[PDB]
Amino acid sequence: GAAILPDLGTEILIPVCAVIGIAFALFQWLLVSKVKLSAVDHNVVVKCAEIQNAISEGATSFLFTEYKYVGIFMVAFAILIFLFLGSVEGFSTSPQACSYDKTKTCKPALATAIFSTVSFLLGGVTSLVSGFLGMKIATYANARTTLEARKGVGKAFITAFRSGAVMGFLLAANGLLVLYIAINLFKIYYGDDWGGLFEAITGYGLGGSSMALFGRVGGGIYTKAADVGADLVGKVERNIPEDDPRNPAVIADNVGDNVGDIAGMGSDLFGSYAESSCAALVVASISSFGLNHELTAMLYPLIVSSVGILVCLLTTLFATDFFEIKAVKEIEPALKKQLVISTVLMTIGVAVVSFVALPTSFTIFNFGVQKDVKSWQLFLCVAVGLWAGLIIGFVTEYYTSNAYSPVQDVADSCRTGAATNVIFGLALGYKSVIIPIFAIAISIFVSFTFAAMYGIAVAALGMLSTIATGLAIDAYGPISDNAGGIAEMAGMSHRIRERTDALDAAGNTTAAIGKGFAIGSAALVSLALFGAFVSRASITTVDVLTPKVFIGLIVGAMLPYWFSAMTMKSVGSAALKMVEEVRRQFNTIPGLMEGTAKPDYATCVKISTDASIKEMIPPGALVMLTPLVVGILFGVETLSGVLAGSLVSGVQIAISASNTGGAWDNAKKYIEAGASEHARSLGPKGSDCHKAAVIGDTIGDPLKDTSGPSLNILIKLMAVESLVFAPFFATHGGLLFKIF
Amino acid sequence: GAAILPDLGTEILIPVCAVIGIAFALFQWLLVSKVKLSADHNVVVKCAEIQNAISEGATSFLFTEYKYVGIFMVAFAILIFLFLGSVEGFSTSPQACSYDKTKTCKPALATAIFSTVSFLLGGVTSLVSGFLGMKIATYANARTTLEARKGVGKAFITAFRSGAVMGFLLAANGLLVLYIAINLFKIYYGDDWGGLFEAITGYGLGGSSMALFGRVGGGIYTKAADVGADLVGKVERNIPEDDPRNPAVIADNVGDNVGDIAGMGSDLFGSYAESSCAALVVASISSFGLNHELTAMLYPLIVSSVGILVCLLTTLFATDFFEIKAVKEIEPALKKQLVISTVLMTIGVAVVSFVALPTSFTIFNFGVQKDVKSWQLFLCVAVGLWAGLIIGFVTEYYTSNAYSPVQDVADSCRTGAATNVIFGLALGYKSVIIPIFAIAISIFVSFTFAAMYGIAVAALGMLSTIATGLAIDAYGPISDNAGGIAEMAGMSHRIRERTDALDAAGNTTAAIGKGFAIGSAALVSLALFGAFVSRASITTVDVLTPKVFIGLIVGAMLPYWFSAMTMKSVGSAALKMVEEVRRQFNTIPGLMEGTAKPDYATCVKISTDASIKEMIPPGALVMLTPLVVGILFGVETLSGVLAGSLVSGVQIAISASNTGGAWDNAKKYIEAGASEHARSLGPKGSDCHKAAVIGDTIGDPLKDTSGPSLNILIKLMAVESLVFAPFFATHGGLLFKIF
Ligand SMILES: [K+]
Ligand SMILES: [K+]
Ligand SMILES: [Mg+2]
Ligand SMILES: [Mg+2]
Ligand SMILES: [Mg+2]
Ligand SMILES: [Mg+2]
Ligand SMILES: [Mg+2]
Ligand SMILES: [Mg+2]
Ligand SMILES: [Mg+2]
Ligand SMILES: [Mg+2]
Ligand SMILES: [Mg+2]
Ligand SMILES: [Mg+2]
């Protein structure tokens, strides 16, 4: 049946919303351009600009290098997709009867092999763009945030947040518009075969996350090598400020924030958005919506994202125009209110969307069977994801903000040294997983019960329906991070650094939250994808108690540890090289410590560049090859266990690592800020307590910025990869069992 | 058909081998008593006053601890009787056999009562396991010290002999009490072997239940002391490890016995007991138990019987035949024990498989009787036997300072504590790869040949050499105490260097112990899980259903929740300990100088208090989970909980224990300075050394409190779920029956 919203309306609505989000982005970038600076104390404006140029140059330089390799791998992998998928049917041009309706004729598998390759390259390119554009806004906004810190926290908050919003709206609108264009273009060929149309479209999410994996790991190793070395020698060893221009590793540190925390994070979340939409589309494609060619209801997930863009635009105005911050304690609650307002507004918007864009009754594909589902049930599926996210947000704030006991107790444990700081920080992280998991479990149960894999997919998308805002508050953080980096390097007033420090502490929390959303939605979408894989692979039952499934389960559960081993070791080793180099300069460059001689920043940039371009390959190989090796050698049943295991296991370590690192960082920020009697008693900077906090913070650096956040990509990537290659594994896989 | 070995041969063989194991243990204790002492000669007295202090403190805490757990044990036995008694409304009449409708079985109420009995038997045998181990350990520690005056080889021997006393006593005792209980229970049950062995699984629930609290309680006690002592003593005050001026040193050394010995003993007993019981429950409704073939039915105990003899002979090799002259011989001699035992036991299992099984039989396999050949069972127990050896090898590689991973971790101390920790975390994560593969291969091989019986019997294979296993492991804390006593006795520097060498090998040895514990825990839990699914009459555990999946993800979360509790508890107590040690050094005149004596008792009290109180919540989480989920959500959801906690929890268990042990041995590497590289990180007190100590104390709760207790979390929930399966299947799933 039709929805109230006609098919042609939907065709207009979606791009109109994408354009509005892009226009909003441009507008905000315009208001940000009103902060003037140039390299041509006017000396402080000039100095900020030179430091900005050095960071902008370094970030653009690394991404070009990183993206070169990644782009080459993308082209190579696109060839694997075409060959493997095309080999399922012997590269035949013959049409065959539709698997979803034998009375109809469908386009040949070969075309779907071709179009899958096309959508994979689309998604890979859009992912690269997402990280790159993010880096361009951040390296533009950073020094403008620093100058605005002269007028106070509030003002600096606005430019950092407006800019964060520039990244959020661009990335969401562009991801939505590309997906919308791909669908229409593919439709010209596929016609009434919507089954094959949306099967080909799933490459979009595979391309998104493939590129994101390397972006996150690569950028992550770069930034943390620099960060750890800079901090340990400068702060623990040489008793100088954080980001002191005498430190040779500092430019690389600050390039690092843009190259990992921004560019990697942006690709990462684009991957989340693309997989969630694609997962919803495929299940819908062989459900009542796709089978009856009802465009509006078919595109229900895109309509949800369209309204999310508009909802977030409104929400943004509360932080941007309707409120002014005047005190430091207002920063975090303003960020939190962004999540609360969007959640409340999006709940109404999802209700409207479910009312106009769905028929009241319809059927959802449920493992071979059409299940009767009502529109108010679908409303609940997306709403429970959206609300699970907010919960995850509130909980993650509790565990990572220095406004609450857990982090203050972590800081407090520094009084007995580094070892107690770390014991307390590890325990906090472990503790932190409890409620997010229960929230995710509730989303799964609710959405699984109402609408099977479609419901779960749409719950994932629900959690990401407010992605423009989520990205805004997240991207706000590394921009505020660089801003204080620039303030210190430019030799600015202490009052400036105190304000940037307040913005940056809130950005640590907001970064943790962003990881909570990525992990939550990854658990959801991976389960939707897992269930779709099982159908696509003609598995009758994924039975835990068969030898093939179980070995997949326990091996899958180990993958996140193997992956974390590799990334931790990489950062550890490169940071070790970094400490040696920084020590060498402090110890052998005459006048460096006295500020009369300038250090060699390029060498530190090179150390972190060489380690990340090299060391990103094994962890990327582990994730990308696992489904292929398991699918080809052991078959689809074993891969099933691998998908379930990696999901349930990876999510625990992902969460605990991200929150542990977050807690260590803000515990240190709390000592640095000395804003209460307790904080002050752990001070001053340079005290044994502070240096113990720094030890904890630097251990947390690769935890929260390299391994931790990349884990969500491991999970969700192996799941789309498995789905896309499913026909190939089902037909030509399981070799070991076939030859024995 | 039947075996070559007659039922009566088996009835005699099993206790004969136990009593041999006890005799051989009683023997080694006599030899150790040839070393004499009572409270140079100034030293011998001091060593004995120190020993007495440690022995007094160990005994005191266990009585306190065992008092709490014994009372919990009585409370829980009541729940077993009630819940299992309620399945058939406390009827006294027989009913149809759960495994065969066409037959009549003993009433469920009787089985409710015998489960309670075997539970209490298992609890008591678990405390006796822990207690005896503590007795011999606190007996042999000063005796290892005084024979350290006469070189490494001597001290090693009295240490290893004393560890054999524990290994052989626990192994022989656990086997004898089970054998006896089976024979006693068989009086009532008669031909109903299904009911007999369903009752007997209480034994496994008993051992592991009391083990949970002894590992956790004992683990929190020891690491509170350990961390406080090492932080104020070595980091802050620049005084030697185990220095008598440090008020926490008695508590530290008490802790090695109360935790690493007693807790660990209970732990491995539980492993032994659950493994045997799991093999018995599946066999009992297979051709062996249906044809009432007593020999074949008791195949698991016959494997354990020969295991003792094999370990006895293996022991002679390190005790008699060979002698250590260079410290670099210790680690090899201990691994030799593993290799020799694995080789001799491969022969013994083949023999046992040849004489105790029919050539063909059937194994219960989810409703269907599955054809299995005795040569296939041989491979099931052997594959578990060899997976254990592989796990030991890989664990040595990642924890011993004779290889690159640990040496690299030590090396990273040049760049501070932060790099030491990052490198140690990564080593732990990395260390899980091969053990999981070995475990997955054992699972595939044993599952394919013989379903859950095969898996259960692969678990027992990995624990078939448990006497040797416990011997090498118990050797460690004795050696650890031995050097603590040496230093407290003010003895020469060469004494401490010897004991430090012994102590270092014992670190690796403890990591290996944990590998066997986690390896067999994965295997037994999987078999138990499979028996739980049958007993609860679940057709299929389908991962893609809402009930199973939410159980899967929540179960995967449980080991982190558990790790959170046990780490914070150590972190909190050790924070107090540091403040207490600082207080004594900063208030008591003559303390730092050495003209005054510290109050050791305030440190004992801090860790005593913290452990007794803080062991409760993680014990609650583990005991309550199957009850809460089974009653509220049902057997489908609990099935997910069991699978998820298993696959998730072994990862964090392995990584935590190896990271911990690696940090410890990297520290020992620096403290020994036995190479140019080691020496370049020294001397003791250097920045590198202090960074190592930071890492070591972080690894303390990881490897001694949370890590090793994780293996108990997993196997405990599994038997707990199996025991209460009829109850959950009948009266559980409430939330779904209401809404
Ligand atoms: K941040
Ligand atoms: K030890
Ligand atoms: Mg830093
Ligand atoms: Mg930064
Ligand atoms: Mg910074
Ligand atoms: Mg930060
Ligand atoms: Mg950092
Ligand atoms: Mg210690
Ligand atoms: Mg000790
Ligand atoms: Mg010791
Ligand atoms: Mg040790
Ligand atoms: Mg220790």
Curated annotation (Swiss-Prot), chain B:
One of its GO terms (cellular component) is vacuolar membrane. The record marks 215, 260, 267, 274, 704, 715 as: Important for proton transport. InterPro entries: PPase-energised_H-pump. This is Pyrophosphate-energized vacuolar membrane proton pump. Its EC number is 7.1.3.1. Its main location: membrane. Mg(2+) 2 binds at residues 226, 700. The chain crosses the membrane at residues 8-34, 58-87, 109-136, 160-189, 193-221, 260-285, 294-319, 328-355, 375-398, 421-445, 452-478, 508-536, 547-575, 605-633, 635-662, 706-731. It catalyses: diphosphate + H2O + H(+)(in) = 2 phosphate + 2 H(+)(out). It comes from Vigna radiata var. radiata. Keywords: Disulfide bond, Hydrogen ion transport, Ion transport, Magnesium, Membrane, Metal-binding, Translocase, Transmembrane, Transmembrane helix, Transport, Vacuole. Coiled coil: none annotated. It is found in: Vacuole membrane.
